[PDB]
Design an enzyme around this catalytic site. Structure first.
Site, PDB file in Angstrom:
ATOM      1  N   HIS A   1      -7.140   6.828  -3.745  1.00 31.10           N
ATOM      2  CA  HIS A   1      -8.004   5.653  -2.772  1.00 31.10           C
ATOM      3  C   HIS A   1      -7.567   4.901  -1.546  1.00 31.10           C
ATOM      4  O   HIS A   1      -8.342   4.503  -0.764  1.00 31.10           O
ATOM      5  CB  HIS A   1      -8.383   4.621  -3.830  1.00 31.10           C
ATOM      6  CG  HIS A   1      -7.647   3.627  -3.885  1.00 31.10           C
ATOM      7  ND1 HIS A   1      -6.362   3.500  -4.599  1.00 31.10           N
ATOM      8  CD2 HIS A   1      -7.550   2.332  -3.408  1.00 31.10           C
ATOM      9  CE1 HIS A   1      -5.838   2.321  -4.891  1.00 31.10           C
ATOM     10  NE2 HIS A   1      -6.332   1.683  -3.829  1.00 31.10           N
ATOM     11  N   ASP A   2      -6.204   4.858  -1.503  1.00 31.00           N
ATOM     12  CA  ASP A   2      -5.455   3.993  -0.385  1.00 31.00           C
ATOM     13  C   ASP A   2      -4.557   5.034   0.115  1.00 31.00           C
ATOM     14  O   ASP A   2      -3.549   4.656   1.139  1.00 31.00           O
ATOM     15  CB  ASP A   2      -5.129   2.834  -0.855  1.00 31.00           C
ATOM     16  CG  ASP A   2      -5.909   1.800  -1.041  1.00 31.00           C
ATOM     17  OD1 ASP A   2      -5.335   0.665  -1.557  1.00 31.00           O
ATOM     18  OD2 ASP A   2      -7.019   1.870  -1.031  1.00 31.00           O
TER      19      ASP A   2
ATOM     20  N   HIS B   1       0.881  -1.235   0.021  1.00 34.20           N
ATOM     21  CA  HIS B   1       0.163   0.027   0.064  1.00 34.20           C
ATOM     22  C   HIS B   1       0.775   1.234   0.002  1.00 34.20           C
ATOM     23  O   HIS B   1       0.666   2.082   1.027  1.00 34.20           O
ATOM     24  CB  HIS B   1      -1.082  -0.079   1.075  1.00 34.20           C
ATOM     25  CG  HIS B   1      -2.151  -0.802   0.629  1.00 34.20           C
ATOM     26  ND1 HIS B   1      -2.078  -2.272   1.410  1.00 34.20           N
ATOM     27  CD2 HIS B   1      -3.390  -0.687   0.368  1.00 34.20           C
ATOM     28  CE1 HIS B   1      -3.289  -2.832   0.841  1.00 34.20           C
ATOM     29  NE2 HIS B   1      -4.223  -1.901   0.112  1.00 34.20           N
ATOM     30  N   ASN B   2       1.538   1.414  -1.036  1.00 32.08           N
ATOM     31  CA  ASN B   2       2.384   2.409  -1.443  1.00 32.08           C
ATOM     32  C   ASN B   2       2.063   3.267  -2.821  1.00 32.08           C
ATOM     33  O   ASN B   2       1.080   2.683  -3.275  1.00 32.08           O
ATOM     34  CB  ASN B   2       3.857   1.846  -1.695  1.00 32.08           C
ATOM     35  CG  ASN B   2       3.979   0.918  -2.927  1.00 32.08           C
ATOM     36  OD1 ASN B   2       3.570   0.933  -3.582  1.00 32.08           O
ATOM     37  ND2 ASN B   2       4.854  -0.264  -2.434  1.00 32.08           N
TER      38      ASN B   2
ATOM     39  N   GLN C   1      -4.241 -17.275  -3.698  1.00 30.65           N
ATOM     40  CA  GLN C   1      -4.561 -16.786  -4.957  1.00 30.65           C
ATOM     41  C   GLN C   1      -5.785 -17.378  -5.751  1.00 30.65           C
ATOM     42  O   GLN C   1      -6.387 -16.765  -6.360  1.00 30.65           O
ATOM     43  CB  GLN C   1      -3.160 -16.482  -5.907  1.00 30.65           C
ATOM     44  CG  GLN C   1      -3.070 -15.223  -6.505  1.00 30.65           C
ATOM     45  CD  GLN C   1      -3.515 -13.947  -5.804  1.00 30.65           C
ATOM     46  OE1 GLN C   1      -3.933 -13.731  -5.121  1.00 30.65           O
ATOM     47  NE2 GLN C   1      -2.768 -12.968  -6.466  1.00 30.65           N
TER      48      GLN C   1
HETATM   49  C1  LIG Z   1      -2.994 -13.711   0.786  1.00 33.13           C
HETATM   50  C2  LIG Z   1      -4.092 -14.009  -0.271  1.00 33.13           C
HETATM   51  C3  LIG Z   1      -4.012 -12.880  -1.417  1.00 33.13           C
HETATM   52  C4  LIG Z   1      -5.249 -12.736  -2.120  1.00 33.13           C
HETATM   53  C5  LIG Z   1      -6.638 -13.008  -1.216  1.00 33.13           C
HETATM   54  N1  LIG Z   1      -6.534 -11.794  -0.239  1.00 33.13           N
HETATM   55  C6  LIG Z   1      -7.961 -11.516   0.073  1.00 33.13           C
HETATM   56  C7  LIG Z   1      -8.339 -10.977   1.476  1.00 33.13           C
HETATM   57  O1  LIG Z   1      -6.979 -10.958   2.129  1.00 33.13           O
HETATM   58  N2  LIG Z   1      -9.026 -10.710   1.930  1.00 33.13           N
HETATM   59  C8  LIG Z   1      -9.320 -10.072   3.455  1.00 33.13           C
HETATM   60  C9  LIG Z   1     -10.399  -9.059   3.471  1.00 33.13           C
HETATM   61  C10 LIG Z   1     -11.360  -9.852   2.358  1.00 33.13           C
HETATM   62  C11 LIG Z   1     -12.605  -9.675   1.881  1.00 33.13           C
HETATM   63  C12 LIG Z   1     -13.138 -10.312   0.962  1.00 33.13           C
HETATM   64  C13 LIG Z   1     -12.127 -11.046   0.239  1.00 33.13           C
HETATM   65  C14 LIG Z   1     -10.943 -11.204   0.331  1.00 33.13           C
HETATM   66  C15 LIG Z   1     -10.518 -10.626   1.469  1.00 33.13           C
HETATM   67  C16 LIG Z   1      -5.961 -10.497  -0.495  1.00 33.13           C
HETATM   68  C17 LIG Z   1      -5.499 -10.344  -2.097  1.00 33.13           C
HETATM   69  C18 LIG Z   1      -5.342 -11.211  -2.822  1.00 33.13           C
HETATM   70  N3  LIG Z   1      -4.612 -10.985  -3.998  1.00 33.13           N
HETATM   71  C19 LIG Z   1      -4.654  -9.869  -4.532  1.00 33.13           C
HETATM   72  O2  LIG Z   1      -4.275  -9.982  -5.916  1.00 33.13           O
HETATM   73  C20 LIG Z   1      -5.158  -8.699  -3.902  1.00 33.13           C
HETATM   74  C21 LIG Z   1      -5.128  -7.603  -4.452  1.00 33.13           C
HETATM   75  N4  LIG Z   1      -4.936  -6.377  -4.954  1.00 33.13           N
HETATM   76  C22 LIG Z   1      -5.614  -9.140  -2.580  1.00 33.13           C
HETATM   77  C23 LIG Z   1      -5.978  -8.025  -1.899  1.00 33.13           C
HETATM   78  C24 LIG Z   1      -6.849  -6.945  -2.397  1.00 33.13           C
HETATM   79  C25 LIG Z   1      -7.183  -5.770  -1.641  1.00 33.13           C
HETATM   80  C26 LIG Z   1      -6.824  -5.696  -0.307  1.00 33.13           C
HETATM   81  C27 LIG Z   1      -7.075  -4.388   0.311  1.00 33.13           C
HETATM   82  C28 LIG Z   1      -5.886  -6.501   0.216  1.00 33.13           C
HETATM   83  C29 LIG Z   1      -5.500  -7.575  -0.628  1.00 33.13           C
HETATM   84 MG   LIG Z   2      -7.554   0.517   0.436  1.00 31.46          MG
END
Ligand SMILES: CCC[C@H]1CN(CC(=O)N2CCc3ccccc32)Cc2c1[nH]c(=O)c(C#N)c2-c1ccc(C)cc1
Ligand SMILES: [Mg+2]
Ligand code: NA
Ligand code: NA
Lengths: 315, 315
Positions: free
Chosen positions: A106-107, A66-67, A267
């Site tokens: 946004h972030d 988040h950079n 993923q």
């Molecule tokens: C370690 C797994 C990696 C995988 C799954 N993960 C999902 C996740 O952590 N959360 C926690 C809260 C939540 C609510 C609904 C669905 C999922 C999740 C986070 C993520 C993934 N892959 C991504 O490409 C991106 C990206 N861009 C994110 C990602 C995207 C946005 C943010 C704010 C944080 C993380």
């Molecule tokens: Mg954000």
């Protein structure tokens, strides 16, 4: 400044975001506003557009994920989606402006640790925003503290009717990038998809929230050369949270624990359950997205599953 | 020290509220958390309860209306409707604790200029809360800052799981005192009123919000000896704003303008179109609400509409 080749390249989700420094990415953002006709149409001062972007950059922190480079990516994807789906036909310049400017902001000022952390730990933030998206509230609040500073006020030649409209528009779109609201927003979006009405302001408001949401998490859409590093970056940030929670005696999400996760499992989960549904519903309105965005989401999932049996044989 | 004519007079809504000095009203609010069980129940400290209340006195302001006294009226009214309606059968002491405690913190640090000013003046507060209930978020925010201090944390001995239910409850309640959400709340309340069910957390949650609102605005329920000095106060604030608002080019409400308001006219619609129909749908679930409350209202309306023809003959 900008290579007519690059100029072409920048509009596509391919575009290698890793070949760029900050201050070159800023020169890319400057371009997008000029190219999209925002500068001409809202009499943005070209010096003030440069100063603002610096001001913005300045106020993202040095987090693993988040950079500034996240923000640039999200922007660059929104720019990409604007060309791919010909969004300047379906939206006003004032909607377009809102999308871009949201995407960038946004972030903003992200501290590295999500709301869950903010909340559980009773952070000055979550105290101050009463557990309702303390992050995403803050992102906005910064975004406009910045715009308040006259030398970073790119809206300075928009009169108040305009500004009020953009403000609401940005605040909506930024607040929609809390994921706690993902299904909420995704449901309401599918409901309105049955009979989508480009006349209908609530439909467009949803559509817009989706678009920034798509961008707020488009990483995997890019080539895997480009995409994969982000995952490490994300995890690095995640484990950096849980270690501090495990330290302080605070809840730990299964997605953020070192022991339980692998790159490959998390993923696969995210691509199949979150991404491809969202990019599917959006493909209905814009068919040209299947080819350009679903395809390398499908590929990226096919790779991670071959990488899964390789994570399973070892340990 | 409280004489048992006072200890009798507090449990009913007549209770005169202009008599008692600050330190004396603190004693009443102490009495209520012992008397309603919450000291005995929640293991609440008997000095953290007198510090938290003297603290909570320091963080109201010297406002013509929205002052500590307003906080007392609303909680003391909130006390009145626990006995009146017998809410200790229907609602849990958690729900009893939230409702009491919300009432006490609900208009905390109010500056005496409403959402519509903060926003239109783009004040630090409005920027921060992004135009979304700027004050009702600020009140809630100041609240849980006192209760994060360890020498005022009345919930000290409460679990985070209990505290977390007292959190996402007291929150929901104080964000309901934005009259700007009034319309929205009422209609969602009668949506459940069709077929009311004390088993359902939502119906019960909605009930809880209604109850607290009725209190913020519960002045003309009281005897018009007690109830009418809060319309000299409300307007003294309302004018102070509309003086600055005209003086800073900012829109002014009709209902706050100096030269469109006469006490009577103001409260007649505020009684007919707000108070009466709220208390009327409170009474379907709790009939004793009719006798005690809907009565001194009906008579205050009569009283004001005659007061109207004294005003109309003059002008
Ligand atoms: C370690 C797994 C990696 C995988 C799954 N993960 C999902 C996740 O952590 N959360 C926690 C809260 C939540 C609510 C609904 C669905 C999922 C999740 C986070 C993520 C993934 N892959 C991504 O490409 C991106 C990206 N861009 C994110 C990602 C995207 C946005 C943010 C704010 C944080 C993380
Ligand atoms: Mg954000
Ligand atoms: Na920085
Ligand atoms: Na004070």
């Amino acid at each position: 400044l900008l290579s007519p080749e690059t100029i072409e390249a920048l509009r596509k989700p391919t575009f290698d975001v890793w070949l760029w420094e900050p201050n070159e990415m800023l020169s890319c953002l400057e371009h997008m506003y000029h190219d999209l006709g925002l500068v001409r149409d809202f009499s943005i001062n070209p010096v003030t557009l440069r100063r603002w972007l610096f001001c913005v950059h300045d106020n993202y922190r040095n987090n693993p994920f988040h950079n500034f480079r996240h923000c640039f990516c999200v922007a660059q994807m929104m720019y990409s989606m604007v060309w791919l789906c010909s969004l300047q036909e379906k939206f006003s310049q004032t909607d377009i402006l809102i999308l871009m400017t949201a995407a960038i902001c946004h972030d903003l000022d992200h501290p590295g640790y999500n709301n869950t952390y903010q909340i559980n730990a009773r952070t000055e933030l979550a105290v101050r925003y009463n557990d309702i998206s303390p992050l995403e509230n803050h992102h906005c609040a910064v975004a406009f503290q910045i715009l308040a500073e006259p030398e970073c006020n790119i809206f300075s030649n928009i009169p108040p009717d305009g500004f009020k409209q953009i403000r609401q528009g940005m605040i909506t779109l930024i607040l929609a990038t809390d994921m706690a609201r993902h299904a909420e927003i995704m449901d309401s979006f599918k409901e309105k998809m049955e009979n989508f009405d480009y006349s209908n302001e609530e439909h467009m408001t949803l559509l817009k929230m989706i678009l920034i949401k798509c961008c707020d998490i488009s990483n995997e859409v890019r080539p895997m050369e480009v995409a994969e590093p982000w995952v490490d970056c994300l995890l690095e940030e995640y484990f950096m949270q849980s270690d501090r929670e495990k330290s302080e005696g605070l809840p730990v999400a299964p997605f953020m624990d070192r022991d339980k996760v692998t790159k490959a499992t998390a993923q696969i989960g995210f691509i199949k359950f979150v991404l491809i549904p969202m990019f599917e519903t959006v493909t209905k309105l814009f068919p040209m997205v299947e080819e350009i965005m679903l395809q390398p989401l499908w590929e990226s999932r096919d790779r991670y599953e071959e990488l899964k049996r390789i994570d399973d044989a070892m340990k």
